[PDB]
């Protein structure tokens, strides 16, 4: 039991989060109210102190004579579902016959949705995002031709054996999930849960995963979060022999049940690499367009 007064009157162990703000409903845009003229002293709503770090609480009712406007413009399309529940390209796998890419008939793809700029810049608006997903696989020939071929889409989680071939033993999918499809069918579409050991994925990780000295050898590890390495996507031509059709598998991901935290500045520079916020330092481009002078247009 607690006897001394500094321990009885202590705020240690206050687990309850003390919040200043509260979320209120805003199904529509705020309505404008009627305003008249103001000719007094002391009350000066146009003057702010931006050094506070807050934003201006000035409205148009206090800057001009306004009318009543009953707004019925909905804020429903700015939600995170409506902004992210839109399938976009996150992956592309090529299965050729001759060449170097994948000349054996199988292809493993380390899952990362940071290889296509248009979906990456949408997620990197936040640093933490938690969601369930819906992946869709659009398979076709280079020319776009639909051909009579069977494939197997195996999810290889981390730790499970990756297939070293088409005739491999990992393809028996006794415990790993798999999808068999013909190219003549609609694209395969499966729903995936939130599968992180953490409470949210994170597109930016300011740190190293491992302890120890950090020399130039193990500097690749900077930024790598194992909580986002969700495993491997594998694909093959179901068969003991060589296929006759070249193939491409394109992967489209749609988020659902989205939560996000901590918005960030948006990428203005061209991406260069996967899971690396590097940029071209010689060819730094300004965020927008330029002028000849500041007094013109």
């Amino acid at each position: 039991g607690d006897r001394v007064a500094d321990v009885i009157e202590s705020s240690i162990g206050d687990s309850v989060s003390r919040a200043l703000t509260q979320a209120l409903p805003a199904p529509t845009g705020q309505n404008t109210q009627v305003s008249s003229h103001r000719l007094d002293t002391g009350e000066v709503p146009a003057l702010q102190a931006a050094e506070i770090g807050a934003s201006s609480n000035t409205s148009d009712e206090s800057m001009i004579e306004t009318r009543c406007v009953l707004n019925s413009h909905s804020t429903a399309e700015t939600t995170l579902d409506s902004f992210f529940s839109r399938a976009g390209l996150v992956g592309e796998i090529d299965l050729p016959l001759e060449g170097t890419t994948n000349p054996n008939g199988y292809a493993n793809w380390d899952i990362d949705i940071t290889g296509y700029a248009q979906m990456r810049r949408k997620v990197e608006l936040f640093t933490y995002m938690r969601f369930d997903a819906e992946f869709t696989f659009v398979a076709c020939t280079p020319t776009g031709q639909v051909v009579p071929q069977l494939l197997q889409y195996m999810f290889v989680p981390p730790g499970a054996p990756k297939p070293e071939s088409r005739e491999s033993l990992a393809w028996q999918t006794a415990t790993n999930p798999s999808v068999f499809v013909k190219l003549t069918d609609p694209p395969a579409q499966v729903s995936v849960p939130f599968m992180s050991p953490a409470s949210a994925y994170q597109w930016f990780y300011d740190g190293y995963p491992t302890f120890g000295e950090h020399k130039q050898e193990k500097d690749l590890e900077y930024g790598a979060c194992p909580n986002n390495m969700m495993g491997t996507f594998s694909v093959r031509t179901v068969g003991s022999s060589k296929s006759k059709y070249p193939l491409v598998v394109r992967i489209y991901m749609r988020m659902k049940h989205v939560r996000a935290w901590i918005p960030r500045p948006m990428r203005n520079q061209n991406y260069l690499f996967k899971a690396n916020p590097n940029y071209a330092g010689n060819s730094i481009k300004p965020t927008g367009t330029s002028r000849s002078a500041i007094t013109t247009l």
């Binding site: 206050d14 770090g53 930016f204 060819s283």
Partner: protein, 245 residues
């Protein structure tokens, strides 16, 4: 009533007569880890006054040709006082912070600094300039400590992201004709309830001049910027030998 402030935590006390206000980050004050959010079962140590107190790191000089500086948290306190021993002796760490930046100048001085908190401030590099080399930053750039590091390209924050949208995070301004202190209170921000203090840095602290310092020949040309910061609601768990990195 709002330009004066006294910040007392521990055995430490800051006065300011020319303040703006206090920024409480994301409208959350720092707190302790609840039993629902917790997963580790060891009892954490909660040293109230020996680690939750104001620490003063160093002093950067605001010159005309300045570009900016960043500091990474909690790397700034991993070699300092009792905090940087509990953090080395333990494996897990949880804390908020109160950052407080000081820059004094006269009434005949002009300039502005953006003082901002950027979570998970991952550091990119110029990639050889051409963008072909997949270069990486060394350890003395991602965890630079209390000395901080000088921004090479502060327009993109050395991460390809514009400085102009950085007010979407926490921030204050130090406008020398209005204020000389900038006080931000940051909670613990991570996907996990605890994490390592030596491997992972939760956020960065940017100090960038948007408006450049100017004065006429005769005034005090040394305008220092001093970083002063206090942990809040600190918690440590998982005790073993002291390792530094």
């Amino acid at each position: 009533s709002d330009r004066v402030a006294q910040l007392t935590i521990g055995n430490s006390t800051i006065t300011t007569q020319e303040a703006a206000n206090i920024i409480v980050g994301y409208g959350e004050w720092p707190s302790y880890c609840s039993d629902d959010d917790a997963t580790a079962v060891d009892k954490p140590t909660r040293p109230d006054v020996s680690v939750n107190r104001f620490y003063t790191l160093d002093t950067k000089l605001w010159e005309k040709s300045s570009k900016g500086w960043y500091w990474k948290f909690p790397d700034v306190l991993t070699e300092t006082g009792v905090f940087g021993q509990n953090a080395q002796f333990h494996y897990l760490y949880r804390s908020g912070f109160c950052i407080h930046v000081q820059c004094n100048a006269s009434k005949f001085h002009q300039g502005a600094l953006l003082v901002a908190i950027l979570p998970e401030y991952v550091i990119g590099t110029v990639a050889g300039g051409t963008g072909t080399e997949d270069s990486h930053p060394p350890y003395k750039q991602t965890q630079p400590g209390a000395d901080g590091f000088e921004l090479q390209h502060p327009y993109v924050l050395d991460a390809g992201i514009p400085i102009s949208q950085l007010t979407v995070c926490h921030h204050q301004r130090i406008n020398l004709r209005t204020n000389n202190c900038a006080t931000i209170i940051v909670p613990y921000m991570n996907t996990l309830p605890f994490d390592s203090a030596l491997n992972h840095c939760n956020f960065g602290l940017l100090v960038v001049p948007i408006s450049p310092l100017d004065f006429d020949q005769g005034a005090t040309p040394v305008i220092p910027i001093t970083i002063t910061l206090a942990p809040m609601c600190s918690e440590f768990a998982g005790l073993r030998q002291a390792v530094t990195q």
